[PDB]
């Protein structure tokens, strides 16, 4: 609300929301695979709704 906003037109560029870690993080890879796992179920997509 107040629902006075509307998205018109396609995207002007491409952006991906990804989980960020300091260059070469120890969790960098485990979090990538866990992200993968949650993306494999697309938990993120339900969380969107």
């Amino acid at each position: 609300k107040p629902c006075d906003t509307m998205k018109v037109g396609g995207n002007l560029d491409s952006k991906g929301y990804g989980i960020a870690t300091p260059k070469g993080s120890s969790l960098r890879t485990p979090v990538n695979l866990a992200v993968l796992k949650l993306s494999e179920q697309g938990v993120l997509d339900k969380l969107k709704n």
Partner: protein, 42 residues
Amino acid sequence: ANLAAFLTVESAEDLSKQTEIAYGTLDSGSTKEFFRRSKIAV
């Protein structure tokens, strides 16, 4: 006047809400798999 004006000058939701047009995917494809596993209600 309006005769004049009227002489001078569709979505995934739509597919889901109908069945008249046999809408489908590759029977042997990841597209079919997208739908078989989609967590989206629609």
